Each structure stands twice: as C-alpha cells, then as structure tokens.
Amino acid sequence: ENLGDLPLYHSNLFEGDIAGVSPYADKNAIVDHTLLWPGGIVYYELAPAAASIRNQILEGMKEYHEKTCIQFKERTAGVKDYIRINRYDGCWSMVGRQGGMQELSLGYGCEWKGLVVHALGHAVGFWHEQNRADRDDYIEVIWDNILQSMQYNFNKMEPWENNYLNERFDYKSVMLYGETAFSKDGTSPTVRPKQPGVVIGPVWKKPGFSESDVRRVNRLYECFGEVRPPPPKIPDFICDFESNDCGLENQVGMRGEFQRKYDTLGGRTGYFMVLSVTSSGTYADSRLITPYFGAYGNQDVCMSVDVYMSGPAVRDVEISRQDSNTESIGKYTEVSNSWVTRNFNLKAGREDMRFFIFAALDPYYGDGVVAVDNLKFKRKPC
Ligand SMILES: [Mg+2]
Ligand SMILES: [Zn+2]
C-alpha cells in the first residue's frame, strides 16, 4: 500500500526527492527561479545502471508524449543541457532545467510508472501539490504525526503566485504525496483530505497524469491546438499609370518608344501607354514588356487590358503570354477606332507569366495611335 513510496523520501533531500535545493529553502523563491526546457525538448542519457530498466523509463516518458507537447530525445552531439538518469538511493530529480548535465535518480523500487512520471515531473518544472499556497482549503496537516526533523517538507507557499493558482487543487495529482508521507511510525497520517470520502493514496500506483496534471504541463509549455487564421487572398493586380510606370519596360533595338503619357483618346482623359506617329515621321514598332506575375496556386488565371487603336498607320497589335515558350493569345489587324477590353483566360503550369504588347505603325498610310490602359491580372477564370 504505502511502502511503495518509501524511495521518494530521502533524509538529505528537499521534500524527500528534490535535489539541488537546500532543505530549509524559501519555497516561494525556488519556484520562481524554475527554468523550463526550450521547445519542450528534454534531452537525456542513461547511465549503465539505468539501462537495465530502460523499458520502464520509456513507459513514463510515453505518458508525456501521448498527452503533452514534451519530447524526450536522446542526447546527441552539441547538446549541453540534458538529464543523465542513474540508479542512486531512491527516486529524485532536480526541479527544471539546470544548465549542463543534470542528474535524475531512478533507484531500487523506482520502476513504477507513477514514480517515473513523478520524478520526470520535477525534471520538466513541477513542484509538490501538498504545499501550494491554497492547500489548507483541501488538506489538513497533522503536524503531530510527522517526524520533527521532517516538518519543513510540509511548509506551504505564501500567497502571491502571480495571477493566482490557475489549475485547481487536484487530489489525483501524481505530484501529490499520499496520506502517510514522512510518517513517524509508518501508518499514522501526516495529511488528511478535507473533502468527504476522498483518499489521495500512494504515487507508485497512480497510472501517470490525472486530467489537471496534463493541463498544467500544456499551459507551462504552451502546448495547444488553436489553429492560426486563414491566409489573406492573393491581391489581384491593376495598373493605372497615373503616378508610375508599373514596371512595364520597352525592348532596346526597336523603332518606336511606348511612353507613359497623359492625354485624351476615344472617350477617356487620363494616363495610358501611347505610341503615336505623324505622316512626316518614320516606321515605329514597339514591344511593351510587362513584369513577371506568379499564380501562387494551381489555378487558371485571367489577364485584362483595354486597347486603343486608331488611324490608318496602325498595321498590327499583338498580345502574347510567355511562360517557358512564347504563346500568342491575341492578334488585332483591324483598327477598332475605339477602346476594347481584351479578355484572355489562361492556364498555369507552375512558372511566372509576363506579357508582351507589340504594335506596328507605318506613317506611310497616315497618322496612327496605339494606346494601352487598365492592365489587370486575376488568378481566377476570366
Ligand atoms: Mg527529506
Ligand atoms: Zn517529488
């Protein structure tokens, strides 16, 4: 019944099994100075004495893996902070990460899942449930049934554990000593539960975490499920030319120069790309090279462009989509003598698209204008 917990109560150790703490230490101060494992990644190694019980060690660890975001990894090259597990006298551990090698003992009698999960509980950050600031609301300490050299092991924390307790006093906590801990004669109780009918019982028979233990671990280590919000829509492009070039450049060795121009043409009065010739002038051809646009997702795009063509000098206006090979999508030989929104629906392999706007003007036949406006790029079927 209660003799299974005897390797938990060492004489020269803080609260029986807390190593690296001074037996009569301020309990508020040592808790505040507790360090946690970055990322919930606890590195470890087994001493040769601890190898003989490796299955029972991996059993307690299996408890953290299955319910929390704590990962027990074997120590590899470059790791400096880790737990060396050995078999000393009884079960015990340092509370939190110490920095450098730290010891955990899993002695004779410490094979039980309860004691493995208990000692590993100290290792990752947790203290004793019986000494919480509010424990006296839930348990009575029969000071007269405790050994006089052992009484500090029951001193509770003073309130002011900033933003209060958080998880409620849990009687099924694997971090809670059973009724006969530190008993003077072994059977007389040192702790009495105030809640009618309740018995804490020993730790070695507890199968791992209770529901409240899991909450504490997941809260300390920010373990969670709350899914991040969905990503914003891909912003559809729309050029105006009213304050910029938009990135659309010209080919070098050409006869015409497509220039960013403010004027009036066929109803509208604003900024549009204009290529124009006079009867007196010379042959002008120009290739407006549009910037490179990504599709981001496996979807059929759509490109819009308002095209203006006027004058007998307009010989030909060609729009082409280039990806890995240049493909012609539109060829306009007839002069519309108006603005016409050209709508090209296109498919996407997996590479960025740029567009070409070619225009040829021969002043031999008369005057001519080729204007370009409202250049849009939507990643959805036209
Ligand atoms: Mg002790
Ligand atoms: Zn303990």
Task: Measure 370 CA to ligand 2 centroid, in angstroms.
Answer: 84
Two tokens at 347?
A: 């498919």
Ion ligand 1 neighbours, Cβ < 5 Å: 11, 13, 16
Task: Measure 52 CA to ligand 2 centroid, in angstroms.
Answer: 23
User: Is residue 217 within 8 Å of 64, Cβ to Cβ?
Assistant: yes
Task: Measure 134 CA to ligand 2 centroid, in angstroms.
Answer: 19
Q: What is the phi/psi pair of residue 275, to 5°?
A: -120, 110
Task: Measure 13 CA to ligand 1 centroid, in angstroms.
Answer: 5
User: Is residue 74 within 8 Å of 56, Cβ to Cβ?
Assistant: no
Task: Measure 167 CA to ligand 1 centroid, in angstroms.
Answer: 27
SS3 341: strand
Give 7's DSSP letter.
G
Picking from 379, 382, 374, the residue whose alpha carbon sits closest to that of residue 345 is 382
Picking from 257, 260, 236, the residue whose alpha carbon sits closest to that of residue 378 is 236
Domain with CATH 3.40.390.10 in the chain: 3-221
User: Is residue 359 within 8 Å of 316, Cβ to Cβ?
Assistant: yes
CA distances 239 to 245, 290, 377, Å, are 9, 11, 9
Query: For 302, how many CA atoms within 13 A lie in the half-sphere containing its CB?
Result: 11
Two tokens at 332?
A: 């306009």
Ligand nearest the Cα of residue 15 is 1
Task: Measure 121 CA to ligand 2 centroid, in angstroms.
Answer: 8
Helices in the chain by DSSP H: which ranges? 27-32, 48-51, 54-67, 113-124, 211-220
How was this model experimentally determined? X-ray
* Residues contacting 77, CB < 8 A, separation 6+: none
Ligand nearest the Cα of residue 116 is 2
The number of angstroms, rounded, from the C-alpha of 221 to the middle of its chain's C-alpha atoms is 13
User: Is residue 252 within 8 Å of 68, Cβ to Cβ?
Assistant: no
Instruction: Give the whole-angstrom CA distance, residue 306 versus residue 53.
Output: 78
Task: Measure 81 CA to ligand 1 centroid, in angstroms.
Answer: 26
Report the CATH fold assignment for 237-378.
Answer: Jelly Rolls (2.60.120)
Domain with CATH 2.60.120.200 in the chain: 237-378
Two tokens at 160?
A: 């002011």
Task: Measure 95 CA to ligand 2 centroid, in angstroms.
Answer: 9
* CATH superfamily of this structure's domain 3-221: Collagenase (Catalytic Domain) (3.40.390.10)
* Residues contacting 90, CB < 8 A, separation 6+: 6, 7, 8, 9, 10, 17, 105, 107, 108, 109, 110
* Residues contacting 156, CB < 8 A, separation 6+: 27, 130, 131, 132, 133, 135, 136
Q: Resolution reached, in Å?
A: 2.4
Picking from 17, 37, 26, 21, the residue whose alpha carbon sits closest to that of residue 88 is 17
Task: Measure 152 CA to ligand 2 centroid, in angstroms.
Answer: 14
Ligand nearest the Cα of residue 128 is 2
Ligand nearest the Cα of residue 92 is 2
Task: Measure 205 CA to ligand 2 centroid, in angstroms.
Answer: 15
Q: What is the CA angle 207-208-214, rounded to 5?
A: 140
Picking from 220, 156, 362, 196, the residue whose alpha carbon sits closest to that of residue 277 is 362
Residue labelled with tokens 């307009």: 314
Ion ligand 2 neighbours, Cβ < 5 Å: 17
Q: What is the DSSP string of 107-154?
A: -TT--SHHHHHHHHHHHHT---GGGSTTGGGTEEE-GGGB-GGGGGGG
Task: Measure 344 CA to ligand 1 centroid, in angstroms.
Answer: 81
Picking from 47, 74, 203, the residue whose alpha carbon sits closest to that of residue 129 is 203
